[PDB]
């Protein structure tokens, strides 16, 4: 009861951060295309930690926020859900232009 | 478990106020987040069957 | 963000991850009163009323 | 046989022009909507998709 | 021209609340002449149904 | 409305720190019961 009454106090309440700490956006790249542009509208970028990125096959990734993905006809290792990344290569260069 | 899927999301709340406190976003990756947490917390060659 | 890639043989996604503080703190003032307020510092998803 | 039939639930709605009101509770509470005067959108620039 | 204006406050929760809730039966007890269903309509504080 | 917090100290993104926002009795409880019932990962 001491711990309970001491944890119900406002100034000391539980705070959690998701360990990934990343907003996950998938940008489609067709088969033969070799370039991609990510257009992001204006934002206040308050406290951005940085960028992290690989390319994942479309057939190996379920459609996000899906109760049931009817096109998902693959049952190997979803590199999106786990850390099974294998296409960190095939990345020539990258440019970032805040404006 | 259905993580980060709003259409079929989980539900945690008190009974007095049936207001769900778990909001799941399609743009967060709960499962890869747990992957990274576990990998940073310990070496991955360990086989924990539980 | 402009990317140049090696041309693969099948459609692929580019799994871009930003650096966000997708935090939450839990407010439990009384018995069976559970309330959490979320926050994601670059891409907060909260909207007005 | 009953296992050799299907179902094709469908609708047609002509001359309607689907409407999504910019109101918090999705009802009509005034022409100047509930969220049309909230100083999250009116006073701050947002880029909807 | 005159315009009616929404109440813009004290009319809709800013909290994450479900617009529409489905209840699935706790008990079924299917019988030969009927199909019973038993639910548990949980209306928490701050809700009116 | 009685707190007026800069919205980043609220979520401890730029806050003072765990050693100076938990109650001193809470910190004592965490230190005493720290060998078997951890609480550091919750703040």
């Amino acid at each position: 009861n001491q711990l309970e009454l001491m944890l119900r106090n406002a100034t000391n309440d539980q705070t959690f951060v998701d360990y990934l700490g990343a907003k996950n956006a998938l940008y489609s790249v067709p088969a033969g295309s070799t370039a991609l542009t990510i257009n992001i509208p204006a934002r206040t970028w308050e406290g951005m930690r940085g960028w992290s990125f690989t390319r994942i096959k479309a057939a190996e990734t379920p459609q996000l926020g899906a109760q049931y993905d009817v096109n998902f006809k693959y049952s190997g290792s979803i590199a999106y859900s786990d850390g099974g990344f294998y296409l960190s290569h095939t990345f020539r260069n990258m440019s970032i232009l805040f404006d | 478990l259905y993580h980060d899927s709003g259409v079929c999301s989980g539900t945690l709340n008190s009974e007095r106020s049936g207001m769900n406190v778990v909001v799941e976003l399609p743009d967060r990756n709960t499962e890869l987040s747990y992957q990274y947490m576990l990998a940073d917390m310990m070496s991955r060659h360990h086989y924990f069957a539980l | 963000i402009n990317f140049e890639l090696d041309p693969m043989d099948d459609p692929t996604y580019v799994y871009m991850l930003y650096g966000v503080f997708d935090t939450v703190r839990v407010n439990q003032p009384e018995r069976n009163v559970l309330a959490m307020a979320y926050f994601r510092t670059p891409f907060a998803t909260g909207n007005a009323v | 046989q009953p296992g050799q039939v299907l179902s094709y639930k469908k609708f047609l709605c002509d001359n309607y022009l689907w409407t999504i009101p910019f109101s918090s509770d999705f009802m009509y509470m005034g022409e100047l909507t509930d969220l049309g005067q909230n100083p999250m959108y009116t006073n701050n620039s947002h880029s909807m998709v | 021209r005159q315009t009616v204006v929404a109440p813009t406050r004290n009319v809709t929760t800013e909290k994450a609340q479900r617009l529409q809730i489905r209840f699935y039966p706790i008990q079924t007890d299917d019988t030969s002449t009927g199909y019973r269903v038993r639910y548990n309509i949980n209306v928490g504080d701050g809700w009116v149904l | 409305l009685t707190t007026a917090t800069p919205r980043l100290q609220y979520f401890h993104i730029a806050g003072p720190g765990t050693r100076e926002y938990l109650s001193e009795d809470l910190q004592q409880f965490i230190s005493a019961t720290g060998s078997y019932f951890d609480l550091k990962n919750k703040f």
Binding site: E46 | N20 | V24, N27, Y38, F39 | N44 | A16 | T5, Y10
Partner: peptide
């Protein structure tokens, strides 16, 4: 509970 009078980038307030 937090009050967030920010015109951009508000909190979620799952609450209850």
């Amino acid at each position: 509970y937090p009050f967030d009078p920010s015109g951009v980038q508000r909190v979620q307030l799952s609450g209850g």
